[PDB]
Structure formats: structure tokens, C-alpha cells
């Protein structure tokens, strides 16, 4: 435990004093001593120095993951992870708390830390009239070499409304893409009705009002799909069908749990036999088939459902709903257009091509076009820096530290101390007193004045909005996510296995 905690601090001490523009520098010296150099880069110092500590090699792969996202903030990841391991010494002797319970306390603290930074985050998106107009011009530049360059106005307009109308996560998991044949690309339009290829039902109506959607995964029709190898021992042919008829009687136990929920719409990945489906007709239950994987997850996001396939207790679950389910037919194929989804946020771009070659090139080019538009949400958006954002996160941790059990009480409280260590180290390299600035900053933000921060030039507390010192919000989440994953493995280590040299 000493090499994984104290031994990891010495690795973080090299990047500790090098954080910030006023930070110190380190020396990398070889045997000949004439090849040396002086630089503040944290990734260069760690990779150049050979590490005989087998526990220090874990932090090497952590810096490589951070460098993939963005080339800034690699130093702050090791420094923040070193403060969590430094306080881990007190988490053993005078605490005696299970390490995984301490990690679970960080997940509850990181959830409130990201929500606290979102409300205090600012952006340059103000005067959106100029901002929203430039979004369509950027998408037209990405249309070069792509078949979508034929019409810039109509094709880029669908990509513009596919971003701002989301009001949430910009990941492609909220956007549905459908590839169909027998049409032209100019007829494509934006529709939120969640259009998919397959239909459902035969004699059932195509319109459903006040629908209740529930997501589950089970096989209700002819389980054990492979019959090869079985041996049927029966006294008569009619006695062999008794096992199949006995299974139909047991189907009422699974149907009764569904009927008690009062849902007219069911989701199934596999098929359904006529008898359990005929019982759904009297109850007015329609089952949707061929939901794949994204169709299962994306349906729970727009309707507010759950992805669990089992029922742990009756009359307790997460249920969705939609106002109207409309089924139309276009291109000689039936389509499913949902309407009136509660709090539904998503978009579905239906690409209608004339062949298979135009569908694959349009989908791959749309992902690259939407990636630039979605990047503008995480880019140029900053937060108040200079100790501000570091202290604001400490207030959200203290809120969770109020109501807590006995095991995670010291774990959540220890995370709040590491958050104040970031402005403490930055104030050390600035040449001023860190204990005086961090202490006065907590008492000010405690009651009101959440925009205050630490001024490095004047060595006092000043308004960050007037000084104009801000730090990117994407950098804040990247460091917390990297520190949460790096500390999750290290705290669970009860023994060290030396890696084999290559």
C-alpha cells in the first residue's frame, strides 16, 4: 500500500510544481549529462525517466488516454490523482473503510460536481443570431468530396436543426439513421417520430391513443431454439404435446405481471406465439418486434424508460408513454411515426437514396458533419477559473456529505479536501500564501457570491467576470473523468505484481 500511495506521490511531485504558467520546472539528466533539457511538459518528464516502481506504470497509461481527447490538462490529471492517494493514508489507519465504498463515494461526489459546474458555466454563444447563422456555413464546408455537395442549403439545414433542438447530450446515440432504397436524396426530411423499418401486428389497428411503453427482453415463444440432440420418451404421440401445452399455462404468470401495469404497448426482441398474442388482443396490448440494440436503449431515453429485462417487484418500475402512435406507408414499406412523446428530445434523419453506395457515403459523411457542429457545444464554452470552479465543487460535495451513512462519511469528506488542493498548489507557484487565499475563498462562497475567485496578480479575491479569466468546461470534465477512473483501480490494489519487461 505504501508503493501504491506514497510511491505514487513522488511520481506526482514532478508534475506538481510544474502546473500553471508560473509553475516551476524540472531537470532531466542522463549519464553523459550533455543531452539534458529544461521543460515544463509533464508527459515528457514521466516518459523519459525510467520508473523502477512497478506501481508507477499504471499512471503511464492514464496520461495516454487523456492525451487522446485533448492535449491540454495532462499535468492536472496526475496532480489531482496524487491528492486523492495522499489522503488515502488517513483512510486506512484512523478510518478503516473499505476501498470500494470510498470509490462509490467519489461517484456520488462527481455527480454533484458536474451538475454544480453546469449551472455556473458561461459561454460565448450570446447573441445567437450571429452564432446560429454561422452553423450552417460550417457544415457546407465539410461537404467537399462528399456526394451531399449537390445541394448545400437543404442538406446542411437538416444537420443544423439536428443539434440545437437536442437540448442535451450531443452524442450520436440520440440521432437515428435509417437507410432505405427507391428514392432521391432531395426528398429527405427531419422527423422526430422514431421511424423504423419493421411493422407489428396483423389485424390490429394502426393508430394508438395514450400509449404506455414498457421495455423488456424475454423469449415467450419456443425457447431452446435448437432441438437437435434431444430425446423424447413418451407412451403415445398425444402425450408428447402435453409438455408444450403445459408451457402455455405457465405463460399466464408472465402475462399477469404485464397486465397489472396497465400498458397497451409491449417491446420484444424475439417473436411471440399466437396464444400469448391472442390474449393481448382482449387486453389491447400491441407488441413491437426487431428492436435491435440502439432501438432498445434509444426508446428508453426519449420515453423515459428502463433497459432492465426482469421484474424485481410488481407495480414498481420505470414506465414510458406517448400520446399517439401513427403508422404510415412510404416507398412501398410501412413506417412507424410516433407522436406526443413526453419530454422527448431526439431527432431522426431519414436518408432516402437511389442505391446502396449512396447510403453508406451519406451516413459516414453525416457523422463527420455533425461531429463538427456537436464540437461547438464543448468548445468555446468556459467556466470561471482562478480557484472559483475548484471551490464551487467543494460546496456540492459538502451537500452530499450532510446526509450519508457511516462508511462513506469520511470518504466523501476527504474528496472535498482534494478539490481545494488545486488552488493551493497554484498559489504556491505564484509566490503568495496559499493557506490565506484558499481559506478566505471558502467563507465567501459559502454564503452567496458564487462568482468570486482568486486573483494571482493582486493576491486577493476579485470578481472573475470583471477580470475575464476563464477556463474551458470540457477540460474540467476530462480531468475529473480521468481521475475517477485512475483512482478506481489504484485504491482497489491490495498487492503489486511487477510487469514483465518487453
Amino acid at each position: 500500500r505504501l508503493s501504491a500511495f506514497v510511491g505514487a506521490i513522488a511520481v506526482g511531485d514532478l508534475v506538481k510544481s510544474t502546473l500553471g504558467p508560473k509553475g516551476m520546472d524540472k531537470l532531466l539528466q542522463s549519464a553523459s549529462s550533455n543531452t539534458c533539457m529544461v521543460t515544463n511538459d509533464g508527459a515528457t518528464i514521466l516518459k523519459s525517466i525510467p520508473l523502477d516502481n512497478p506501481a508507477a506504470k499504471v499512471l503511464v497509461n492514464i496520461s495516454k488516454v487523456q492525451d487522446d481527447e485533448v492535449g491540454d490538462g495532462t499535468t492536472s490529471v496526475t496532480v489531482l490523482s496524487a491528492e486523492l492517494l495522499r489522503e488515502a493514508e488517513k483512510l486506512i489507519d484512523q478510518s478503516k473503510i473499505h476501498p470500494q465504498t470510498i470509490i462509490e463515494g467519489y461517484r456520488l461526489a462527481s455527480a454533484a460536481a458536474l451538475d454544480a459546474l453546469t449551472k455556473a458555466a458561461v459561454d460565448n454563444s450570446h447573441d445567437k443570431t450571429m452564432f446560429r447563422e454561422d452553423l450552417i456555413h460550417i457544415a457546407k464546408t465539410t461537404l467537399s468530396s462528399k456526394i451531399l455537395s449537390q445541394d448545400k442549403d437543404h442538406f446542411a439545414e437538416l444537420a443544423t436543426n439536428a443539434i440545437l433542438r437536442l437540448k442535451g447530450s450531443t452524442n450520436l446515440e440520440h440521432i437515428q439513421i435509417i437507410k432505405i432504397l427507391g428514392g432521391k436524396l432531395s426528398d429527405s426530411f427531419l422527423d422526430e417520430g422514431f421511424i423504423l423499418a419493421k411493422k407489428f401486428g396483423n389485424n390490429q389497428p394502426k393508430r394508438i391513443e395514450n400509449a404506455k411503453i414498457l421495455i423488456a427482453n424475454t423469449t415467450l415463444d419456443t425457447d431452446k431454439v435448437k432441438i437437435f440432440g434431444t430425446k423424447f420418451k413418451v407412451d403415445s404421440t398425444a402425450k408428447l404435446a402435453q409438455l408444450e401445452k403445459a408451457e402455455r399455462e405457465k405463460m399466464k404468470n408472465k402475462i399477469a405481471k404485464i397486465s397489472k401495469f396497465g400498458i397497451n404497448t409491449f417491446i420484444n426482441r424475439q417473436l411471440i406465439y399466437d396464444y400469448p398474442e391472442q390474449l393481448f388482443t382482449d387486453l389491447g396490448i400491441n407488441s413491437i418486434e426487431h428492436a435491435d440494440f440502439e432501438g432498445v436503449e434509444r426508446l428508453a431515453l426519449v420515453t423515459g424508460g428502463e433497459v432492465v429485462s426482469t421484474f424485481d417487484e410488481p407495480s414498481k418500475c420505470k414506465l414510458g408513454e406517448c400520446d399517439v402512435i401513427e403508422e404510415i406507408m412510404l416507398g412501398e414499406q410501412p413506417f412507424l411515426k410516433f407522436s406526443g412523446c413526453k419530454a422527448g428530445e431526439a431527432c431522426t434523419i431519414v436518408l432516402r437514396g437511389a442505391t446502396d453506395q449512396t447510403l453508406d457515403e451519406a451516413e459516414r459523411s453525416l457523422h463527420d458533419a455533425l461531429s463538427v457542429l456537436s464540437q461547438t457545444t464543448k468548445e468555446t464554452r468556459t467556466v470561471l477559473g482562478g480557484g472559483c470552479a475548484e471551490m464551487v465543487m467543494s460546496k456540492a460535495v459538502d451537500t452530499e456529505a450532510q446526509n450519508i451513512d457511516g462508511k462513506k462519511s469520511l470518504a466523501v469528506e476527504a474528496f472535498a479536501r482534494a478539490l481545494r488542493q488545486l488552488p493551493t498548489i497554484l498559489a504556491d507557484n505564484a509566490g503568495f500564501d496559499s493557506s490565506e487565499l484558499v481559506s478566505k475563498l471558502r467563507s465567501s462562497i459559502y454564503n452567496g457570491i458564487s462568482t468570486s475567485g482568486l486573483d494571482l496578480n493582486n493576491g486577493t479575491i476579485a470578481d472573475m467576470r470583471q477580470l475575464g479569466i476563464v477556463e474551458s468546461y470540457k477540460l474540467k470534465r476530462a480531468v475529473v473523468s480521468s481521475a475517477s477512473e485512475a483512482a478506481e483501480v489504484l485504491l482497489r490494489v491490495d498487492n503489486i505484481i511487477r510487469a514483465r519487461p518487453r
Binding site: 511531485d13 514532478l14 510544481s17 508560473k22 516551476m24 520546472d25 524540472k26 531537470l27 532531466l28 539528466q29 542522463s30 549519464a31 549529462s33 539534458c36 529544461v38 518528464i45 523519459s48 525517466i49 525510467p50 504556491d428 507557484n429 505564484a430 509566490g431 503568495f432
Partner: protein
């Protein structure tokens, strides 16, 4: 982290105090005995620090500071080391008071910028249009060299060479375009400017070589005349492609691999009167590509007419043991008219020290190009800064207020060393300078002792960033 910095400051202070004894011509010379058995003796600070083979990592930074000191200002390589050690010596008590090095580092950069404006107000504003102060500056600077009576003749030659290439807004001028070619024979009184270009070697001494040609083209060619590695047929196509572009001057890069020009090719070039100059050093390859505006040509197919220069007259001047070839009228609008001065003398020890003497003479004149004006040396600019910082230190507040008092005290080390190396009492002479300071200011003018302002300015600027970078390293680890 103090144990790492204090160990580097004490190690650097002993090196700075050792070089401090070498300040001035009367200073104490340091001896260095190499492992091979070679022993050098001189007062140059850059030579001592280069051959000392210092194993201390931070102490090796003084070599880079002394390199930039001679490259920019050209003087004060010893004084910049003394000022660097003076700030490190005063920083020993700063760490005992609990002062973080960031305030120490930020105060040196802020004091270095304010110290320049103080010197400019006390400096006498001069212009480059007046040749009276330009000749007297280079003439008095040569009093430290063997040349005495001949120093007055070389003074206007160095002035007219810089003023042509200085222009106005050019500011820094590359010193690599000025090539001093030393050769045995001749004398100092015989000099030729030859603004076109000057090579480092002679011409072909064999039979058949014209050695002189008028209206010829000069270009860089990396090819070489050699047999196949029948012979006259292979050499015929080589000279035939050169005749297509009418290139009468062939410059072959010196290489020990093969020869330069075959004896059979000399008879072919004698009819066309094509002059060839061999033994071109590798350092002159980049030099000839600038002033002449040509390009190095590796193969025979790369040889073109557009890459060839122009020469009005190429001849071999008759001189004892010299035979220097000159080129005039390069006629290149894109390339600037640089100056290459030929140094001649009977003894080998003459043309050697004469070349080094002209280096410091051109730097002092070049200091006036970047910033005009000059300040007399002898401790005058170092003490004058401390006079203004006495009352200014009271106007500050906080930790930085104490740094201004210690910064003026460290500047007194330079004038104190000048009094010690001259045998006079250290403190007694310094008190006599501050006593008359109430009336006189710059008064050294009657002794014809002049120093450029860039030397005093760069000495403070380089020493400010040096000491700043020393305190930045708090740890030393092994990395391989």
C-alpha cells in the same frame, strides 16, 4: 526543495567568484589543464567556461549566456557572469526570510526593464551620420591589442562597412556575412574592401590556367572533375554542359574523397578561359549562397543559368605569399552588399590576433545600430542605477520593496572588482565615485574610454533571465 537550489547556488557562486578575478586586463588569469595535456592561459570568460567541462547542470547555463553575450553585444562575457553570481549571492538571505522564488524571479525581470530607461535618460544621444564618434569608438577599442599606429587606418574601414549594411530599421545584422580571410604575407597597411565577395583560398597554380577572367558567372557546384570511378571523352561532356550556360567560374567543394580537377580537363578549360577555384570549405558553402544569391548544385542536370551569379572582373592579385582572388560587381539586387575584409601580415601571430581584434571592433559599432548612444565604463553605469533605486525603493510595498534595495547592492560588485584588479582599495575608490556624484554624472571622457550601451543593457537582461531559470528547477533526477 531548498536543499537542491541552495546546493546549485553555492556551486554557481564559486564559479562566478572564480571568473570575477579575471575581470579586466589586469585581472587574475585562470589555468585549465586538459586530460590530454593541453594547458590554455587567457582572461576570456567564454573560453574558460567552455574548456572547464563543468559537471554541474545549472552551472553549464553560463556558457549559453556567455555565447549570447558575445553574439549580441560582443563584450562583457566576464561581467555578465559576475552579475549572475551577484544575484545568486544576495538570494541566499532571501530564502531565509521565507520569500518564494516567484517574487524573486518576477522582480528581476521588472527591474531589468526599468533599468534600461534609466540608462537611456543618462546616455548621450548620438547619430550614425556623424563619423567623428564612429572612428574614435573603434580606434580606442584597439588600444588593448598589439596594433597601435595601424589601428587608426583600420578604423574608417570598419565604419564604412557597417553603415552600408546597417540601413535604419534593419536592427540586428547577421555577422556571418562578414568573413575575415587571413593569409601569410603582405602587411596591415594594404587593405581591400572588395564588397562583392572574398574566398578563403587561392586559384589553380598549374600550367594552362588563365587565373583571370572578365565578365564571368559564379555559382555553387557540388560536382567534381574525376576520371571514371576514353577519359577525355567523359570529361568533354562535363565541360560542354557548362558552356551551354556560359559559366566561366567553377567552385568545387573541398572533399578528401576524390580529387578536384583532372589535369586533362585543364587543357580543355584553357581554350574557353574558364577559371576554376578549388578547396572550398564547407563553412563557405552557406556564405557564398547568401552574398552571391546562388544555390548549391549537386548534379549536372540541376545546373542552370538562372542560378548563376555575375562578376564584372575576376583576377588574381599579385602579392607575396598571398595571391588573393577578388570579385567585384556581383550585380545582385536581392542580395545585400556585405563586406569581406582580407587580413595580411608576415607573421602568423599577426593575422590571428588581428582577426579577433576586428570582431570586437565591429560589434561595438553594431551596438549603435540597434540602440544609439554610449555610456562610459569603469563602474559609471552600475553605480548610476543604484543612485536612482535608493529613493525608488521607498515607494514600493510588500516583499518586492526589499528586493529593490538588494538589487542595487549587487550592482556594486562590478565597480568593486574593477578597483581590486587595479591594485587600488576596493571601498575607498567606490566612495570617491559616489561623493562627486552630487555634481558630476558621467565623469573617463578625457582618457578616451568609451563603451556601448548594448553591453550594459544585455548584461542585465541576460543575467535576469539566467538567475530566473536557476530557481525554477527545484529537483534533479536521472533520466535515460
Amino acid at each position: 526543495p531548498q536543499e537542491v537550489r541552495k546546493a546549485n547556488i553555492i556551486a554557481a557562486r564559486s564559479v562566478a567568484d572564480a571568473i570575477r578575478t579575471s575581470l579586466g586586463p589586469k585581472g587574475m588569469d585562470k589555468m585549465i589543464k586538459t586530460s590530454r595535456g593541453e594547458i590554455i592561459i587567457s582572461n576570456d570568460g567564454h573560453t574558460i567556461l567552455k574548456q572547464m567541462a563543468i559537471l554541474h547542470p545549472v552551472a553549464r547555463m553560463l556558457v549559453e549566456v556567455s555565447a549570447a553575450q558575445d553574439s549580441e553585444a560582443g563584450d562583457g562575457t566576464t561581467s555578465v557572469v559576475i552579475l549572475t553570481g551577484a544575484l545568486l549571492g544576495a538570494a541566499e538571505r532571501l530564502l531565509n526570510k521565507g520569500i518564494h522564488p516567484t517574487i524573486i524571479a518576477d522582480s528581476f525581470q521588472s527591474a531589468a526593464k526599468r533599468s534600461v530607461d534609466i540608462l537611456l535618460e543618462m546616455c548621450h544621444k548620438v547619430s550614425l551620420s556623424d563619423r567623428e564618434q564612429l572612428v574614435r569608438a573603434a580606434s580606442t577599442s584597439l588600444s588593448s591589442k598589439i596594433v597601435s599606429q595601424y589601428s587608426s587606418f583600420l578604423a574608417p574601414l570598419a565604419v564604412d562597412s557597417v553603415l552600408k549594411i546597417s540601413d535604419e530599421n534593419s536592427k540586428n545584422v547577421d555577422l556571418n556575412d562578414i568573413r575575415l580571410v587571413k593569409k601569410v604575407g603582405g602587411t596591415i597597411d594594404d587593405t581591400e574592401m572588395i564588397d562583392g565577395v572574398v574566398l578563403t583560398q587561392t586559384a589553380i597554380k598549374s600550367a594552362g590556367g588563365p587565373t583571370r577572367k572578365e565578365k564571368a558567372k559564379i555559382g555553387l557546384i557540388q560536382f567534381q572533375i574525376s576520371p571514371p570511378k576514353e577519359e577525355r571523352a567523359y570529361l568533354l561532356n562535363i565541360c560542354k554542359k557548362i558552356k551551354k550556360a556560359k559559366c566561366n567560374v567553377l567552385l568545387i567543394q573541398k572533399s578528401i574523397l576524390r580529387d578536384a580537377v583532372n589535369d586533362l580537363a585543364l587543357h580543355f578549360l584553357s581554350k574557353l578561359n574558364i577559371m576554376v577555384v578549388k578547396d572550398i570549405e564547407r563553412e563557405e558553402i552557406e556564405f557564398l549562397s547568401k552574398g552571391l544569391g546562388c544555390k548549391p548544385i549537386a548534379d549536372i542536370e540541376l545546373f542552370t543559368e538562372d542560378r548563376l551569379g555575375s562578376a564584372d572582373l575576376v583576377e588574381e592579385i599579385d602579392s607575396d605569399g598571398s595571391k588573393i582572388v577578388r570579385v567585384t560587381g556581383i550585380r545582385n539586387n536581392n542580395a545585400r552588399p556585405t563586406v569581406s575584409v582580407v587580413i595580411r601580415g608576415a607573421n602568423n601571430m599577426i593575422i590571428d590576433e588581428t582577426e579577433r581584434s576586428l570582431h570586437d571592433a565591429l560589434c561595438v559599432i553594431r551596438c549603435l545600430v540597434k540602440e544609439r548612444g554610449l555610456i562610459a565604463g569603469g563602474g559609471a553605469p552600475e553605480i548610476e542605477i543604484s543612485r536612482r533605486l535608493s529613493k525608488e525603493a521607498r515607494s514600493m510595498e510588500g516583499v518586492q520593496a526589499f528586493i529593490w534595495q538588494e538589487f542595487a547592492s549587487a550592482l556594486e560588485v562590478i565597480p568593486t572588482t574593477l578597483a581590486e584588479n587595479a591594485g587600488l582599495n576596493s571601498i575607498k575608490v567606490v566612495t570617491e565615485l559616489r561623493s562627486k556624484h552630487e555634481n558630476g554624472e558621467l565623469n573617463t571622457y578625457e582618457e578616451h574610454i568609451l563603451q556601448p550601451v548594448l553591453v550594459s543593457t544585455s548584461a542585465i537582461t541576460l543575467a535576469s533571465e539566467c538567475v530566473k531559470s536557476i530557481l525554477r528547477i527545484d529537483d534533479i533526477a536521472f533520466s535515460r
